[PDB]
Design a protein around this ligand. Structure first.
Ligand SMILES: [Fe+3]
Ligand SMILES: [Fe+3]
Lengths: 381, 381
């Protein structure tokens, strides 16, 4: 088929970069992160929408792999938040090991340049996102260390409220958008070069973040509110503010975000959502954010990671230009990451002060006086 | 003075690499890790044995900066261990920020090659060690992520017993050397290329680790038991096993490890300890491991980081050859790190399986059956 040949050509010319996929959590669920001697299963998985053979088959160019851990269920909230941090390091560890053990398929990327080098080498550019500020145990130091471990976006919330911002699905609303700490965290995220992800956050929190951020943001996996009313989809107001922000909405394959009856959700509906956003805020602000493995069953025609060529072909069939399809596939999210990094370099070059954690005093006045007296003794020598 | 000129020449030819220094903890104590606008104080500290001016003055070539956090004092042991992990990330964060904010003085290093490149550029090669397995919250995944953050040695204990090995200062002995988990951890440390540090561990734990390790180890800061009997100093038995191991004992400036009366401790005693080890196991197995800022007051002549030229001169005055002084200064610890990395490359090249954490089951049988049924539905398409 000529349109299928066109789609295959595009997938080899530009990387299709998907915004969100939970294969790392499936590995935690199925293998408990022990992948030693499990290559046969990692290539042909007995569960889920992602494995290494189907990943190749769908011609995906890059992937933000989610280092998701669930909300803390512990009644002692200090313990649950700290437990979430340990589990986050477990998920980052298995992502890095998955990449390192399959270097002919996966190559770690943390920048626009590293995405392209991976794609030139025929590798799936493998980036990392965390899904909620519950994962950092209320530590901006931990967050910066997660950045050093390769995390390049932070979803401000999952379906858990936190000290910084409001999730969408939970009511009553805690902060009513962003907290004062949330506002201050946006400055730090921009300064360090961490991409802000507004998926799973409340409509008001999105509006505030879109007005405050000095760098373009993403929705790693959400769809269009005007086509399907859901707390997780992006309103017309926030689509406009996303345009002004220069950000990208990465359209989600979750059936419940595409249709009122989930079993009616299709590939056509995903294309409807992409075209709606593209028409109204331009095709330079729309992406693809499957959320594969964040669901049991995908839409008709988008059942797993092998189905991306059908999406590319579907967009071309509906009249979306070759150049605009390339933008939706991955050039837009590359641009956002590039601009996020440029903003960070500009702020770090200007010597902007970093956000520090509030720490306990470890020394009393007696220890400090002993130390200052000792220093003066040394000065006299 | 001709011997002082000789010492200055050596310090410019080869990096003096010190094994252990607690300046990061002093920054936590004094500034609570907020170093914004504190350069005047970081160069001229009102407390402690380390600052950036005196660091330059003593001509130090490199430093393993300790990311120490204290033993968990919380009666709930789960919480304390998790709290220690968060605090470890805080200390790694401030070390990286200290290096990044002063790039004319400090340059991050994690290898023999990066040590030399830092030294060629006139920078203090800045490496990182953690001081106890209490810092990893019983997570080998966390440990591997600490390695990715730049940690290149792990002291198996501080003055706290842990699930892996026995500290020296505490009695009664918990495991009686290494536990079964401790033995297994040695294999993983060798596989990942993490240098084993035997300072602060029990005599029996040292003997067992020295027999088991497939890579050379260090004592980052300990002295000689035969000259001063202390639980923290290295016995003749373990010095011999260190020789067989190809490791390095980095001699410590702690007054209590050098003399029975601490106020009698001197630069001469440190030199006595270096010469004892050098004479008996060869000068290729001895280093310098100050533990500056792990004490209030240093030995006479070794009061702070500005005093390293006096040590180099002192060794030359006592008849230690120019080549052997260069070995003690830093070539030995460079060799150990190089061999640790080579052993890791050999084991990783052979495809040796990594140690995995024991995780809880997140899915029940019902969820797994739903997943397998869904996979089969997809196979039929
Ligand atoms: Fe999600
Ligand atoms: Fe110590």
């Amino acid at each position: 088929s000529p349109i299928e040949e066109q789609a295959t050509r595009l997938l080899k010319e530009v990387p299709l970069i998907d915004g969100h996929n939970h294969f790392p959590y499936m590995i935690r669920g199925w293998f408990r992160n022990d992948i030693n001697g499990q290559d046969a299963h990692l290539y042909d998985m007995p569960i889920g929408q992602t494995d290494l053979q189907r990943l190749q088959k769908g011609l995906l160019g890059g992937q933000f792999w989610s280092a998701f851990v669930p909300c803390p269920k512990n009644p002692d909230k200090e313990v649950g938040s700290l437990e979430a941090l340990r589990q986050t390091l477990q998920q980052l560890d298995v992502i890095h090991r998955l990449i390192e053990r399959h270097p002919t398929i996966l190559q770690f990327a943390d920048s626009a340049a590293s995405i392209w080098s991976s794609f030139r080498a025929g590798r799936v550019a493998s980036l990392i996102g965390i899904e909620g500020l519950h994962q950092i145990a209320d530590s901006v130091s931990a967050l910066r260390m997660l950045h050093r471990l390769g995390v390049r976006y932070v979803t401000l919330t999952h379906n858990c409220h936190n000290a910084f911002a409001d999730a969408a699905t939970v009511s009553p609303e805690l902060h009513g958008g962003l907290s004062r700490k949330g506002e201050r965290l946006i400055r730090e995220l921009n300064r360090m070069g961490m991409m802000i992800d507004l998926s799973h956050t409340s409509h008001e929190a999105q509006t505030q973040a879109l007005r405050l951020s000095r760098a373009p943001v993403i929705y790693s996996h959400s769809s269009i509110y005007s086509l399907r009313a859901h707390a997780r989809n992006v309103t017309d107001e926030n689509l406009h503010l996303l345009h002004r922000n220069r950000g990208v909405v990465m359209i989600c394959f979750l059936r419940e975000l595409l249709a009122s009856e989930a079993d009616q959700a299709t590939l056509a509906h995903v294309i409807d959502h992409i075209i709606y956003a593209g028409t109204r805020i331009g095709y330079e602000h729309v992406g693809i954010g499957s959320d594969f493995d964040g669901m049991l069953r995908g839409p008709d025609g988008l059942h797993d990671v092998s189905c991306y060529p059908a999406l590319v072909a579907g967009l071309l069939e509906r009249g979306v230009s070759e150049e605009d399809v390339k933008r939706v596939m991955g050039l837009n999210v590359i641009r956002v990451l590039e601009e996020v990094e440029r903003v960070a370099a500009e702020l770090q070059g200007a010597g902007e002060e970093c956000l520090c954690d509030e720490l306990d005093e470890v020394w009393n006045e007696d220890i400090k006086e002993q130390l200052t007296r000792e220093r003066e003794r040394v000065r006299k020598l």
